[PDB]
Nucleic acid binder design. Structure first.
Ligand code: FES
Ligand code: FES
Lengths: 121, 121
DNA sequence: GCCTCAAGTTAACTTGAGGC
DNA sequence: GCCTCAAGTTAACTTGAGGC
């Protein structure tokens, strides 16, 4: 059967307004019933779930749509997951570089413009 | 001598509007000259520099003020730097946990609510 | 409850109008 | 150039008004 906006909201843990928004930003799809009311394809649950994991990764909605294209496969998941495991990685290396630079500069405090890592990344 | 808003903007690499804002959010201080124009205590350069390093760490302005109290020592720097090297750390561990959880779920794609890490953090 | 659409919210600022 | 203050900008939504 098709899910009503309300249901999807409970099983997703997102506001119905959140679903309206995601659809307007084209991250989920709808179908209108005999009374213009939206009805969702179970699949939506998986997407929303993915939207949230993507958010945790620190990925912006626009980009999450930019990855969604415009019906969810096994390949797709592998395409996304990896594409994110990568950023999650780059991002981490970036933060780690900092932590190293930072540890050196703790006994310093000079913050030399032309000579300190922390300042000239 | 005292620095003019313009100078401080060039040596900081921030908009004069940025300096106005930081001061209003109480992260830097000013002194008005005979014509109500602001004049800065060189020290401001170090703060701004710190505001930016704090931002890189991923710290919010409010919090950066929350750490600044309301005249910059050696102890202060150690108080801040550490206090940030810590968050920079917690944050990293969080991202790393994800990356691990994520790697397991790549050959899966089940996204079992009551059974997958990625979903129930 | 569900639908629409306008406007408000936080963050970190920027842009613009008005005036010296 | 610098000063003030009101309003605009992006992001991710939420709140509210109005109507079925
Ligand atoms: S604190 Fe001196 S080089 Fe970074
Ligand atoms: S992808 Fe199946 S448990 Fe996470």
């Amino acid at each position: 059967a098709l899910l009503t906006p309300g249901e999807v909201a409970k099983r997703s843990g997102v506001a119905v307004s959140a679903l309206h928004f995601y659809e307007s930003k084209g991250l989920i799809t709808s179908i209108r019933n005999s009374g213009n009311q939206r009805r969702y394809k179970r699949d939506v649950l998986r997407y929303v779930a993915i939207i949230k994991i993507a958010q945790r990764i620190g990925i912006p909605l626009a980009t999450i749509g930019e990855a969604f294209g415009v019906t969810l496969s096994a390949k797709e998941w592998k395409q996304l997951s990896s594409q994110w495991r990568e950023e999650l990685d780059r991002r981490i290396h970036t933060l780690v570089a900092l932590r190293d630079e930072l540890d050196g500069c703790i006994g310093c405090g000079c913050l030399s413009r032309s000579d300190c890592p922390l300042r000239n990344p």
